Write a structure and sequence with these properties.
about 200 residues, ATP-binding, four-stranded mixed beta sheet, binds guanosine-5'-monophosphate, Pseudomonas aeruginosa, globular, homodimer, alpha/beta, 9 strands, Guanylate kinase, 2 domains, GMP, transferase
């Protein structure tokens, strides 16, 4: 079966260009499309950026136990649907959940073999620029981002996004090393290992 | 302090070209020079490939508890001197022990924070070349016989294509430096600034 990767970053900027770039260079890796109850933004496509749904429909899915994890982020509900994750892993494909620290905690309990990565800004100034890209609102968004970053200690690996080219290669190294671990290689090269041992 | 890496292969696939190439691209990483009692081979230099010594002197060193690990391989004795390992790690340098599965077990027992990598051939045919025609068969039988110890290693690298295997090794070393503990030490000041309110 495939490997599950959790990738988290401060939520105020949206999903990271780093993960998009990683997926562009490794088309065999899949990414989960989350459900959300927030409204669509210009340039977003239902079924691609998110499965956009209603709060009533989101809660009904929760009652039907369809979410691997869910969380409230800035008052809107987000979640990872479980069936798609199980299907993709069972096909032997690796996949990424780009989710916040709350969802990461839930996933780790259910899947202790999951690799998790937190992507950090190089400075508060750089984080603030990404958020501003109203002043009063900005400081609250910064305080909320700081509270999320405090959870970086819960993650297996950390990437400091100082130089985009360097951070992308750092992500690639984490993913490649994960696939070289004993557990993944034993399954991947099962037939080879049998020939080496017989 | 530095990280200790154990790099192993089936017994007889000696000090690998892969590790040398990795060291060329990793100037902060050192490699331990092993002691051996086998005779020098053409092109080998005492103090570089090995510390070549006698069996009686090897046993005297063993009696003085100077070896972190030691093992018999094809009837010859090999070992890692402990003082150099401790000094190198305490200087903050990473280091590689290129040793067999027996030495790996001893090092894991004494230093559970050590990380380990097993380098696998793509086939038995490929292993045979790397290993007298009779001498080749004795090395092949021993290497195949103890192949199962790959399961004890943290990562596995298939040495099919040299460049691909080298990139695999590099990714393992880089991922270790991206681990929570290494990054917390590297970015302590930054992390404190990010969390300060
Ligand atoms: N737990 C959880 N968090 C999510 C999920 N999808 C997105 N998020 C988080 O919600 C944040 C806000 O996303 P945005 O509204 O900008 O698209 C993201 O930065 C990410 O941290 C999800 O399925 N589960
Ligand atoms: N335990 C242990 N094995 C070693 C050491 N140095 C070399 N070896 C093993 O001895 C094998 C034979 O090496 P060679 O004699 O061809 O140079 C190597 O493939 C490696 O498995 C050492 O210091 N300790």
């Amino acid at each position: 079966s495939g490997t599950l990767y959790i990738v988290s970053a401060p939520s105020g900027a949206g999903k990271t260009s780093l993960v998009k770039a990683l997926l562009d260079a490794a088309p065999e890796v899949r990414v989960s499309v989350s459900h959300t109850t927030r409204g669509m933004r210009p340039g977003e496509v239902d079924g691609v950026n998110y499965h956009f749904t209603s709060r009533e429909e989101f809660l009904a899915m929760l009652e039907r136990n369809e979410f691997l994890e869910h969380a409230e982020v800035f008052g809107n509900l987000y979640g990872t649907s479980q069936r798609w994750v199980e299907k993709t892993l069972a096909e032997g494909l690796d996949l990424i959940l780009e989710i916040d620290w709350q969802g990461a905690q839930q996933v780790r309990r259910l899947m202790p073999e999951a690799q998790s990565i937190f992507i950090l800004p190089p400075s508060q100034e750089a984080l603030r620029q990404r958020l501003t890209n109203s002043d009063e609102v900005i400081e609250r968004r910064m305080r909320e981002a700081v509270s999320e970053m405090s959870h970086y200690v819960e993650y297996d690996h950390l990437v400091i996004n100082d130089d985009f080219a360097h951070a992308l290669d750092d992500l690639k190294a984490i993913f490649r090393a994960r696939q070289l671990r004993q557990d993944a290689q034993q399954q991947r090269h099962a037939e080879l290992l049998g020939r080496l041992l017989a």
